[PDB]
């Protein structure tokens, strides 16, 4: 599946990176395949920003896993950076909430979504990384049930000096939006630092966001820091699963691999592929891209003189 820098750009399907990035559905003209093109005017980025973006690409080419959205192509067009990725037809889980499940999702659907996320985090944590942006907007549901974790841009490596560090102390750049989802020890920026167990806090946060339909803490950023430094909140197992994710002490929060073994994931019988399309029941994804329905105002998610 090779791609050349020649793409029909269509629908805005999302935005991001301080609003410098547009997300487009696109038609790859050679083959006729519909994909995502992520585009960033580099003219508007600092030299640093470009480097930060250069880092996301490296890390993505490093990661290879069934619950991680793979990147298919990357290149410069004129003054913009383009990253081609597969189209996740359902959109992100934030789409589904904002667009239809405003009062939250069904608990089984959350069980699949969280399962995919925990599998991906187990892999990235084993690869020596910390995700740092686990949130519903970074969860993509495939054209047929496959759940993907995205947001690699925020991924920081814990391998430093060719050795593995127990803790990191890096306050993540370009993270204003993510703030609510970050662990207390990410945010307090003291001598203990943080590790992989900070994304498990964000899993708990994402859990409440999927279950509730609104993020924990819309209030100003300083107020949510005061509260973080209290915690948000169905089957008994789910509550307890959340309660474990959200524990104040990282050392008492369980890892991704042993979170997999929670009794909350016992309710999963089929694989998310044979059950999730059914669980996002009222919502049908989009198949026919050969219509005006991609130029409809709704969008495509939630359908129901120098002198020398």
């Amino acid at each position: 599946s090779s791609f050349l820098p020649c793409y029909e750009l269509l629908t805005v399907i999302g935005k991001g990176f301080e609003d410098l990035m547009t997300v487009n559905l696109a038609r790859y003209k050679p083959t006729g395949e519909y994909v995502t093109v992520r585009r960033i005017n580099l003219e508007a980025c600092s030299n640093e920003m470009v480097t930060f973006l250069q880092g996301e690409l490296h890390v993505s080419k490093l990661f290879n896993h069934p619950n991680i959205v793979p990147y298919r192509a990357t290149f410069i067009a004129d003054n913009e950076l383009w990253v081609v990725t597969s189209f996740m037809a359902y959109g992100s889980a934030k789409d589904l909430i904002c667009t239809h499940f405003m009062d939250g999702m069904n608990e089984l659907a959350i069980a699949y979504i969280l399962q995919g996320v925990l599998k991906a985090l187990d892999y990235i944590h084993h690869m020596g990384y910390v995700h740092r942006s686990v949130k519903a907007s970074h969860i993509l549901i495939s054209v047929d049930g496959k759940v993907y974790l995205s947001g690699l841009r925020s991924n920081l490596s814990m391998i430093s000096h060719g050795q593995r560090q127990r803790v990191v102390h890096d306050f993540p750049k370009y993270s204003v939006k993510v703030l609510p989802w970050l662990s207390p020890e990410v945010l307090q920026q003291n001598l203990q630092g943080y590790d992989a167990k900070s994304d498990i806090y964000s899993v708990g946060i994402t859990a409440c966001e999927l279950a509730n339909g609104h993020v924990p803490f819309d209030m100003p950023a300083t107020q949510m820091l005061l509260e973080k430094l209290t915690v948000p909140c169905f089957s008994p197992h789910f509550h307890h699963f959340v309660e474990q994710c959200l524990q104040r002490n990282p050392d008492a929060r369980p890892s991704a691999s042993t979170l997999l073994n929670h009794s909350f994931f016992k309710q999963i019988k089929r694989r998310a592929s044979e059950a999730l399309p059914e669980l996002l029941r009222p919502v049908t994804p989009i198949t026919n891209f050969e219509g005006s329905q991609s130029q409809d105002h709704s969008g495509i998610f939630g359908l129901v003189d120098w002198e020398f």
Partner: protein
């Protein structure tokens, strides 16, 4: 509140101003603000000028081992990246007043990195000392207090200098005599040598009155490396290359419990 920054408790207070902790209210980044009393500066000879000058330098400097200037706000406030502790503070926290060799070595290589960078920018720091070397929570050393630094001209052939104004103890024999022109870099090196002498032993190589003693040119007990940095003759004195290649620098010392760093936003 000040801009989007809200204020915290005192972290320290050198000669120029009080330094308080700050918190970025939009991003939530821990930062620090150098607070300077406009009137108190005017009565520090060259106080205003030193500040504008440091702000000029920090605005065009960027390296892992040089302190970062983040913002400048008025009515005066220099917003700096946050550091948990400065080197002298750690030395001050333990009866020994020194570091174990392994700790001191890491700090010293970090310091050579910053110096090499700054010199390559034609910056002669002139006040290298532990009180001027800060530490992030991740143990990254940041050279701070560019207050009395001399930016050399990109077309000056030499690192030739004229003024002193650094801290008295860390001054070489070129300055404890006047002289009139001397290599600026080799002044930094003597100063590195006095900080390395200190962090390793707990003592200072010269007491004091002060200048008469330095301009006469004794080790306790690495020793070869210390004589080289602390040469009386600037010609025989080690260059940064010679420091890097010296076996004490190159050696990986076996790491014993180091000085952990000695023991702010909630009310607000």
């Amino acid at each position: 509140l000040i801009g989007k920054y809200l204020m915290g408790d005192l972290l320290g207070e050198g000669s120029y101003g009080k330094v308080k902790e700050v918190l970025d209210s939009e991003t939530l980044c821990r930062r620090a603000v150098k607070i300077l009393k406009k009137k108190k500066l005017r009565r520090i000879p060259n106080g205003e000028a030193n500040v504008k000058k440091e702000i000029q330098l920090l605005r065009r400097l960027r390296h892992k081992n040089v302190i970062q200037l983040v913002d400048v706000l008025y009515n005066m406030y220099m917003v700096m990246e946050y550091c948990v502790c400065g080197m002298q503070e750690m030395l001050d926290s333990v009866p020994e007043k020194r570091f174990p060799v392994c700790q001191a070595h890491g700090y010293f290589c970090q310091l050579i990195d910053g110096l090499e960078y700054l010199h390559s920018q034609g910056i002669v720091h002139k006040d290298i000392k532990p009180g001027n070397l800060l530490l992030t929570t991740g143990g990254t050393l940041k050279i701070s207090a560019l207050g009395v630094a001399e930016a050399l001209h990109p077309f000056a052939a030499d690192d030739t200098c004229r003024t002193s104004q650094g801290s008295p103890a860390f001054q070489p024999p070129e300055i404890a005599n006047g002289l009139d022109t001397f290599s600026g870099f080799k002044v930094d090196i003597w100063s590195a040598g006095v900080t390395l002498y200190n962090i390793t032993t707990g003592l200072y190589p010269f007491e004091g009155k002060l200048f008469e003693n330095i301009g006469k040119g004794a080790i306790p007990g690495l020793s070869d490396l210390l004589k080289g940095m602390l040469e009386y003759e600037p010609a025989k004195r080690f260059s940064i290359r010679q420091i890097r290649q010296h076996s004490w620098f190159r050696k990986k010392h076996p790491p014993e419990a180091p000085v952990p760093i000695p023991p702010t936003v909630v009310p607000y």
